[PDB]
Amino acid sequence: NALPTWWKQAVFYQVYPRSFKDTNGDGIGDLNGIIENLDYLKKLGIDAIWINPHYDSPNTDNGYDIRDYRKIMKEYGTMEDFDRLISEMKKRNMRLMIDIVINHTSDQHAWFVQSKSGKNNPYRDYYFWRDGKDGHAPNNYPSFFGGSAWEKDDKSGQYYLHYFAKQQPDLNWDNPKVRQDLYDMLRFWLDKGVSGLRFATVATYSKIPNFPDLSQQQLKNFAEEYTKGPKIHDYVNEMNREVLSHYDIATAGEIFGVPLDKSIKFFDRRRNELNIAFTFDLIRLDRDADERWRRKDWTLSQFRKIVDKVDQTAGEYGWNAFFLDNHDNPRAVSHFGDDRPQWREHAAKALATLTLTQRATPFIYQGSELGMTNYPFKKIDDFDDVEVKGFWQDYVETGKVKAEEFLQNVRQTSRDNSRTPFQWDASKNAGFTSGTPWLKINPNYKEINSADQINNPNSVFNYYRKLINIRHDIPALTYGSYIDLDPDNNSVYAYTRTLGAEKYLVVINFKEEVMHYTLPGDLSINKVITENNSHTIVNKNDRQLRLEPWQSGIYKLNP
Ligand SMILES: OC[C@H]1O[C@H](O)[C@H](O)[C@@H](O)[C@@H]1O
Ligand SMILES: [Ca+2]
């Protein structure tokens, strides 16, 4: 086969509206700020935008705790703004993907308000209410965001389930009336001409019959137990049959907690579930499975073996998204590259090259196109994220981990690293806001901003632009098959992308010294498609490359 679609060949950009552009001085990005910057995105070469949740929310989890699914978040604007965003993107031939958060609602959602009003309320079993055991929680389930996954309610004396914050009660998908209400809600958004849906933690919808305790072992890897719900594929396939297949959309599945060998069932096109896999294997390759804020050393051989495994898993019938950072992870150049002033731009370009030459839909997270870095967090109160406060409570306040060792890690791992405001220019607060930004701007905005880069042909921005253009022009870079030349090489990452006789080579030097790299077999260069940081010229039929430190390139190979 090889079944091309607009979503397989799109280059997506992810906008985290809270941090993109504030147009009214309250310190918080808003819909008008996205609208006002569409020409900037269009100039980058972006096809499609995925926005993080835009709905009415008290913001315990920055939009992921939704109090009304049919209303715009007060901080982002009005319904008129949203409809104008859709319409201005349509004018520019850009498609919008929205974030669908239906594993749970805010505890202020009308459904929960009613549900918690008493056992006899019609909405009682829109959520999960269970009696305690021996004066304790129903079972030993922990929450991703701190403490127990069960919260006691005084009125009724029962506990309600929350995998995420106390303010995110989990919806009861086993109740057909819940599923039918959530479908009605999707059609409301789909009817406005939205072109994609990203399903937040899509794999936790089905809860485990009778809530048994997790074993000591399971407590150290509990996400995977929450994804074992026996009806998860029935529910996703049902939502496909009753809603998704009735519209013309691309659907992404965020499979948090799903082992890779179980991912294909969500994305195999024959199964009629979802289109695009968001996996965690690569982006958190170096994260501890138990203490999930903690990181460890990783090597290039480990990284490339994951890329290849994730590629093979999707195989012929599935499809991958490919991203190196987003609003839940550290910035790619700091995490996967070298963010020191001598290497930052070279590494950012190398990782852009890697990103834009995967057999996957690439997602470019806001500010990565400038080479934005992690933020120098000092003290615990410099962080905002509910998640980091939950880890601090579980691990530091219980005395299990010294505060300083915890900070050493979360400085490198915290989601807030991606959430500092987008650095537009060199002006006060990087031009993000006229007032006080909700989260401090990185002081490196003076060196790293869009205004310094958009007209500089050597910039990280224009290198991304050139790579998008190249990807659009060379079908092997989207659909071609992927072969790693040496999964055990810890210095030079080299792989081929092949469609029939059209064969391309991507080479990235991960070392900060010169690497000579002789090609294997009979491979030789036909053309240089692009390089960054090269010094030696590549001629026809070369079988060797002298790679500068952090050099990256794409080459066409002779047939
Ligand atoms: O709401 C729970 C979580 O699920 C989502 O899919 C988001 O990516 C993450 O930011 C959020 O905290
Ligand atoms: Ca604002």
From TrEMBL:
<feature type="domain" description="Glycosyl hydrolase family 13 catalytic">
    <location>
        <begin position="14"/>
        <end position="419"/>
    </location>
</feature>
<dbReference type="GO" id="GO:0009313">
    <property type="term" value="P:oligosaccharide catabolic process"/>
</dbReference>
<dbReference type="InterPro" id="IPR017853">
    <property type="entry name" value="GH"/>
</dbReference>
<dbReference type="GO" id="GO:0046872">
    <property type="term" value="F:metal ion binding"/>
</dbReference>
<keyword id="KW-0326">Glycosidase</keyword>
<dbReference type="Pfam" id="PF23915">
    <property type="entry name" value="SusG_C"/>
</dbReference>
<feature type="binding site">
    <location>
        <position position="26"/>
    </location>
    <ligand>
        <name>Ca(2+)</name>
    </ligand>
</feature>
<dbReference type="GO" id="GO:0004556">
    <property type="term" value="F:alpha-amylase activity"/>
</dbReference>
<feature type="binding site">
    <location>
        <position position="24"/>
    </location>
    <ligand>
        <name>Ca(2+)</name>
    </ligand>
</feature>
<keyword id="KW-0106">Calcium</keyword>
<dbReference type="GO" id="GO:0016853">
    <property type="term" value="F:isomerase activity"/>
</dbReference>
<comment type="similarity">
    <text>Belongs to the glycosyl hydrolase 13 family.</text>
</comment>
<dbReference type="InterPro" id="IPR013780">
    <property type="entry name" value="Glyco_hydro_b"/>
</dbReference>
<feature type="binding site">
    <location>
        <position position="30"/>
    </location>
    <ligand>
        <name>Ca(2+)</name>
    </ligand>
</feature>
<feature type="binding site">
    <location>
        <position position="28"/>
    </location>
    <ligand>
        <name>Ca(2+)</name>
    </ligand>
</feature>
<keyword id="KW-0378">Hydrolase</keyword>
<feature type="binding site">
    <location>
        <position position="22"/>
    </location>
    <ligand>
        <name>Ca(2+)</name>
    </ligand>
</feature>
<dbReference type="InterPro" id="IPR006047">
    <property type="entry name" value="GH13_cat_dom"/>
</dbReference>
<dbReference type="Pfam" id="PF00128">
    <property type="entry name" value="Alpha-amylase"/>
</dbReference>
<protein>
    <submittedName>
        <fullName>Sucrose isomerase</fullName>
    </submittedName>
</protein>
<keyword id="KW-0413">Isomerase</keyword>
<dbReference type="InterPro" id="IPR056300">
    <property type="entry name" value="SusG-like_C"/>
</dbReference>
<keyword id="KW-0479">Metal-binding</keyword>
<dbReference type="InterPro" id="IPR045857">
    <property type="entry name" value="O16G_dom_2"/>
</dbReference>
